[PDB]
Amino acid sequence: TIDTCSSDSPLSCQTDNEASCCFNSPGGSLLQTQFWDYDPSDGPSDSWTIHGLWPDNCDGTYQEYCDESREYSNITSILEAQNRTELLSYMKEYWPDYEGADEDESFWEHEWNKHGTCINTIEPSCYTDYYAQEEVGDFFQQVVDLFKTLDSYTALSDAGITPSEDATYKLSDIEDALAAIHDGYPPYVGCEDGALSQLYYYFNVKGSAIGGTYVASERLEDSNCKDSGIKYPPKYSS
Numbered sequence: 198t199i200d201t202c203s204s205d206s207p208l209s210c211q212t213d214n215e216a217s218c219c220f221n222s223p224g225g226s227l228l229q230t231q232f233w234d235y236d237p238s239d240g241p242s243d244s245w246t247i248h249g250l251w252p253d254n255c256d257g258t259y260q261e262y263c264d265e266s267r268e269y270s271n272i273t274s275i276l277e278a279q280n281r282t283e284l285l286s287y288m289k290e291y292w293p294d295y296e297g298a299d300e301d302e303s304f305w306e307h308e309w310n311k312h313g314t315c316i317n318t319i320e321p322s323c324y325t326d327y328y329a330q331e332e333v334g335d336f337f338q339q340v341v342d343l344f345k346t347l348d349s350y351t352a353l354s355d356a357g358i359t360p361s362e363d364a365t366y367k368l369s370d371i372e373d374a375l376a377a378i379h380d381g382y383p384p385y386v387g388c389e390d391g392a393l394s395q396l397y398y399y400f401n402v403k404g405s406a407i408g409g410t411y412v413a414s415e416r417l418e419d420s421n422c423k424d425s426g427i428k429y430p431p432k433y434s435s
């Protein structure tokens with residue numbers, strides 16, 4: 198399986214070290230990104246959903262589509278072949294394409310191909326007893342594992358911020374509520390049409406992106422929302 202690195206491995210971006218299987222570089226800022234899909238709605242009425250996991254450069258720029266030889270058009274089959282049946286079921290629920298279940302495959306392809314291929318510590322050469330596309334399944338598992346720790350809906354709810362047809366919200370309140378589950382670092386908060394829409398939680402990593410220690414880090418982009426009047430539209434509203 199993937200190589201293990203010491204739990205006291207040096208932190209990506211925050212240290213000056215050479216890229217290896219145990220050091221994420223140049224993609225040392227890892228973004229766990231989420232959606233609030235209300236029109237059309239997907240996922241549970243009381244949960245955000247997964248967008249992805251993205252390696253950014255430490256300056257906020259990023260690479261994309263970093264290895265054509267490891268781009269796939271069969272994610273669902275790769276997961277099935279690896280017996281990751283609970284993961285695939287979970288992805289259907291919590292990593293949906295808003296347009297419908299039949300577009301999930303294209304979306305998962307997109308995320309792996311664009312961004313997974315750019316995580317340097319995921320490459321087959323970082324495995325013992327590597328098997329074909331092992332790192333693809335591990336990536337989907339890792340995104341899910343990190344997402345589970347970042348329950349945006351509940352963090353917002355606990356701070357009195359819940360979806361509403363009438364209520365509107367202040368950016369700083371949203372930011373503080375979410376900063377509370379991310380070591381006091383707020384995510385990027387993204388709005389669409391004045392509605393709460395996207396979240397990017399930034400991390401630096403000790404060790405490998407698979408199984409390493411994800412340390413909550415400062416956002417390299419703040420928000421495109423207005424300071425107030427923010428709508429949090431209810432899912433499945435009618």
Ligand SMILES: *[C@@H]1O[C@H](CO)[C@@H](O[C@@H]2O[C@H](CO)[C@@H](O)[C@H](O)[C@H]2NC(C)=O)[C@H](O)[C@H]1NC(C)=O
Pocket residue numbers: 266267269270271274275278329330
């Ligand atoms: C998913 O698609 C990939 C890419 O085509 C498949 O991997 C290739 O499999 C072919 C046919 O067995 C081999 O000849 C190639 O060498 C493989 N390419 C690589 C880069 O590994 C893969 O087998 C497919 N997986 C599933 C479960 O269908």
Ligand SMILES: C[C@@H]1O[C@H](n2ccc(=O)[nH]c2=O)[C@@H](O)[C@@H]1O
Pocket residue numbers: 232234293294295296304307308
């Ligand atoms: C990131 C971009 O947003 C679109 N997008 C957004 C949400 C979603 O649930 N599915 C989806 O496909 C994609 O077409 C693309 O991956």
Ligand SMILES: *[C@@H]1O[C@H](CO)[C@@H](O)[C@H](O)[C@H]1NC(C)=O
Pocket residue numbers: 278279280
């Ligand atoms: C999945 O299970 C099949 C059948 O038992 C087996 O051939 C294969 O090695 C398994 N793959 C993984 C990665 O568990």
